[PDB]
Design a protein around this ligand. Structure first.
Ligand code: NAI
Ligand code: NAI
Ligand code: NAI
Ligand code: NAI
Ligand code: 9TY
Ligand code: 9TY
Ligand code: 9TY
Ligand code: 9TY
Ligand code: MG
Ligand code: MG
Ligand code: MG
Ligand code: MG
Ligand code: MG
Ligand code: MG
Ligand code: MG
Ligand code: MG
Lengths: 328, 328, 328, 328
């Protein structure tokens, strides 16, 4: 199938590599690669992270100076401002090149056309799915992790070879796997989660609390303990990742199984409709517009919602309680 | 407030205690109490668990023989068959008593009237919220855990004193806390979760998979990795339990925060309606009827759904994949 | 294709066979097989049918005694009570075996999990589609008939070989055919008919009668003669089975063809919706629950409907008329 | 209650005050305060208003120069551009301070997060409800007026003391009153009016005119005279402010009272729904976004609507008429 369990490391040996940033990924992937036998450099904004990077023994020039020396570059930085940074300080230099290769962690800014490098640059993606600390939590075990790979532009007939070369250049395969997928799929997926089941889950919990309290005379403490103040969800998620989502429920009671299955097959259509709506909203590029404008206005809605959420009853009760249990 | 952080241990010292069962709770609570300085006994069906109980040094008679010797009894056994067991082998003996006390882990069978002991028995509840192994995972740390307490019938003016006595008799407070609550609240809560956000979550995930695959040319492996085959959810749940549900999201990107909050406040009404419907269905006693009948018929629906779920596309793909990653 | 026109008879020669029942199928299939050169026995409730079976020269022990002697067993008895009979008088004995094979006529009780034999028994189906008398009405002609075959559990790598062996052991192929199909498909099909076009047909006839009488001043006799008191439908059905459903209509008038076709293509969506609803109701296992409970209550609805139907106007008129025509 | 009828003047005596602007409020409040015995200064854009300010005897430096000298600052300028002005010319200087206090007239830019001063500055509000000329029209009478007060950030445990100090520093209490209220309430209120009853009123008048003319053959002049070209509304509003909204209607005829009351209680739900929608739209921060973007695009909609309104029939007729009556 489309999977790839291991591959070569030929094109990247002999070349210099440009790593932009020393955050979560940047540090991890960079240290890994240095330890994989390659000549690498770092580009960073001269601040605390720069202190830490030069600490760990990585020569760090300015961004553009690291792009002049390298024939490859990894832009391991945020998604909300990368546009301007690329426009001012990277595009000029890049125009001062002929054979180059650029790789990202996310496909947001490219899938939607906010960044359109020239045709003289092979354009690719390599994206994992962790938060970043799990990857050292796996590397010290000598394991490997899974990732997604994509190619946007090939001007060398070699983008895929560089793709798998990089893949092995970060310690994913062998030990994990590597999937090949467009920039578009990656963005679509990373967003669907952030728009569909996470917020639905949270709203459902909030509603259960509000209902139980204001309509059957229950104490906030008990509600919080049942719903999320207990680590039940965490163990469930672990068992899911280990055994399987359904096989997991065998460790539950028959009553729970019955209710859960019935209600699942009873509400599948509604959420399906919702997911359709949101995925369509995304595929078209509307959400990117919405978000970019909300940046350009001053983040008002962001502000007001962050306020409302924290000034809700549930949050205050959680505050009192977490205080009681010593939890910070 | 209604909370209780510590209390006495007076009524239970000098009396014998009857522990019915040696499963997860039974073993844990029983060993704890023995180690808390009390004279205890065990009643069990003579099978593997009986071997393990007599192994760990607990004299174990027959059930009814343990109820004749004890003035207290803890029925630490399932919720689906306990009815018959109480009718045949416990009610007679109990009628052969005057001052007795009975406590449960769950309020299902009592809140709905499937078990109505005489008026010569103080009736109570003590219910934690773990799965059971976390409690030793906390006891070896000398900590304490939270629980719920309830009283159904008082024929001694002392049910609450026995309640807190038991509470401390199992190593919850001091170290955790103890909430007081009817049998009804406990059942309502344990069920709302099993009917509202768990199945909704699962259906949403399933729908995201189905959509992404059958409508945007996406490979199954990537979908599974993004949604649940990765341990993302587990870390999120842990951070929730530690910091707070909302404060958790600070460790995410602004884009995720924005989308999540907007969509949460956008879909809150729908799930609210759903939760209303289900909670009402429960408060009335309809679900208990449904479930009892489904038992009396031969568990057909249970069977067919357990089949359909496992014969779905997502499950088969998860099978192939988990095999690849070595996960059992 | 999946069809099978003939096969072997090897595994069943040398073994003893257990036939449970001497009703329509039991007698027919048993006599056929005896005449096909096999050593067979019979198990039956000692009543009139037992008299008839021992009459026709089949040694008949008790049920369980016939299962102890046989390595195969055919449960040729009803679907509504077979559960208890299997639980009490068959499951014990079967537990007293290692290599066994069990076959049914219908898949109701198995497809829905009301009967779950051990894993040490190959489980199969062989189901024809007649009412039973047509099969002798074909055997004396040396023909063969069609059937469905299914396998639920294979503990021998041989369930299919036994399947076709049995198939030929009853005189179906060669002469007819044999289709392979799950238990589930068989039940689904046998029920869809009993829920979709039969009752719709009957209700349509009833409605035509009621309308014609109470709204255009027509005589009951004429209505009954036109609709069903005449053998028109029978000849139509015969021609359907012989030539084909559509090619049949050539023997009609052009007017009939035109009206029929137009109205058929005009009402196809409605009945489609209905059929969807009912098939879904079945696939899930709800109907089995409904029916089992209606048994457990005392067949009240059954009773009241059997009353209403017979106390309707159409039935009384049919009574008077059939009396006139000498029809019993 | 929350009201405050008079308070102290202690913290502001000995300190210098920074007044930004010399418009309606700026001039009024500044002259008042100077006349209340305080050392004050002015910051202004060097234009006509600057001429007038230096005319009236207020030393006026540049904006930032007035913020360097003052330990307090009052930003008495518009709400639509204040953002940039604060970003460029005020934030730097303010960063060059430790103990500072800032007060506004409106809470728009702060309630929605368009301006977030540091935590080393106590942030407050003092907002009246006039248009500004009424305040001298009251001061020469030695009266006092009502205002709203708010505190956004306290880094001194003294924000409220400065609040009431300022309050008395402008001649409101004693003589009027002072209410305490968040920035949020002030903005919400100032906007609800501008979105709910003003535009509804205007649309109702417009519709009455259009209807009367185009459907019962009436002359424009009469319609205009009845509806608003007469000063009826003004006298009604005055009586409202004086006596009370309802007690006002006693000076009317019984017929008017009856019709008005009935129709009021008959249409209360509709407008309630409308008001809910708009208030919700505001609380969330959507309107601020809308307005900021409409600025960033070039005020197109503003333009087109200002055109349509003036090119309507009613406006032209009003033009002809007001000309007739000599009204400019
Ligand atoms: N939890 C996470 O942060 C994960 C990030 N990703 C993706 O990788 C990218 C981020 O990777 P990380 O660096 O590990 O996360 P991060 O949030 O720590 O990235 C911050 C980095 O960007 C640099 N930076 C910040 N502001 C800058 C500015 N104004 N100008 C120039 N440089 C600036 C900083 O040097 C810093 O190293 C994102 O695009 C994301 O889609 C993928 C998986 C998880
Ligand atoms: N994950 C869990 O199992 C938790 C259980 N509870 C509640 O506690 C009760 C169950 O406690 P556990 O024993 O720890 O769970 P369990 O599922 O391990 O219960 C098995 C025990 O029940 C006894 N038993 C089982 N079948 C029996 C039968 N036919 N006849 C006589 N005795 C039989 C056995 O002695 C066995 O030890 C339930 O009511 C549940 O509501 C509360 C929190 C979590
Ligand atoms: N003729 C029909 O109505 C059709 C029957 N089938 C299927 O075959 C099976 C029945 O086969 P048949 O015997 O030919 O129909 P049947 O209605 O004549 O069944 C009566 C047989 O069941 C046995 N029996 C009845 N009550 C019993 C009891 N309380 N305890 C023990 N044994 C009892 C008797 O030995 C009797 O011979 C059904 O499951 C049906 O799904 C399939 C095609 C047509
Ligand atoms: N009738 C009104 O306009 C009232 C105003 N308010 C609130 O008070 C504030 C306005 O108060 P006023 O000064 O009396 O109204 P205003 O409209 O006369 O304010 C204009 C002032 O802002 C200065 N200014 C204008 N454009 C500038 C620019 N590009 N750069 C720097 N400075 C500029 C001018 O020097 C002028 O003094 C607003 O925030 C409003 O919410 C409250 C009650 C009524
Ligand atoms: O909600 C609960 O605590 C569970 C139960 O079976 O009672 C584990 C699912
Ligand atoms: O910000 C992202 O990209 C997250 C993801 O879905 O992987 C953490 C939320
Ligand atoms: O209904 C009838 O009798 C038919 C006719 O053509 O008249 C044969 C169909
Ligand atoms: O509309 C009018 O002129 C009023 C009347 O009573 O006629 C005063 C209200
Ligand atoms: Mg994301
Ligand atoms: Mg993600
Ligand atoms: Mg439960
Ligand atoms: Mg629970
Ligand atoms: Mg049938
Ligand atoms: Mg049939
Ligand atoms: Mg305003
Ligand atoms: Mg106003």
């Amino acid at each position: 199938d489309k999977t790839v369990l291991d591959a070569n490391l030929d094109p990247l040996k002999g070349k210099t590599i440009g790593v932009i940033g020393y955050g979560n990924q940047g540090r991890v992937q960079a240290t890994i690669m240095r330890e994989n036998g390659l000549n690498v450099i770092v580009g960073n904004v001269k601040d605390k992270y720069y202190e830490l990077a030069k600490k760990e023994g990585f020569e760090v020039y300015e961004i553009d100076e690291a792009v002049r020396r390298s024939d490859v570059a990894l832009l391991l930085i945020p998604d909300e401002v990368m546009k301007e940074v690329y426009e001012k300080k990277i595009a000029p230099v890049l125009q001062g090149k002929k054979e180059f290769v650029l790789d990202f962690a996310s496909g947001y800014n490219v899938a939607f056309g906010l960044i359109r490098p020239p045709k003289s640059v092979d354009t690719i993606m390599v994206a994992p799915r962790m938060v970043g600390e799990g990857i050292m939590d796996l590397h010290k075990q000598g394991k490997g992790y899974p990732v997604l790979l994509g190619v946007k532009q090939d001007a060398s007939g070699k983008a895929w070879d560089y793709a798998k070369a990089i893949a092995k250049g970060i310690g994913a395969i062998p030990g994990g796997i590597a999937v090949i997928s467009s920039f578009e799929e990656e963005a679509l997926l990373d967003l669907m989660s952030e728009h569909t089941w996470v917020p639905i889950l949270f709203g459902a919990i909030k509603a259960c609390y509000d209902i139980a309290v204001k309509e059957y005379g229950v104490s906030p403490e008990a509600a919080l303990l049942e719903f999320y103040a207990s680590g039940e969800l965490a163990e469930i998620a672990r068992l899911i990742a280990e055994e399987g989502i359904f096989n997991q429920m065998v460790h539950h009671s028959t009553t729970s199984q019955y209710g859960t299955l019935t209600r699942m097959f009873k509400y599948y259509d509604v959420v399906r409709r919702i997911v359709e709506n949101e995925a369509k909203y995304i595929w078209d590029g509307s959400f990117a517009k919405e978000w970019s404008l909300e940046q350009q206005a001053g983040y008002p809605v962001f502000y007001r919602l962050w306020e409302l959420a924290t000034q809700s009853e549930m949050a205050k009760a959680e505050k009192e309680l977490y205080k009681l249990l010593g939890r910070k």
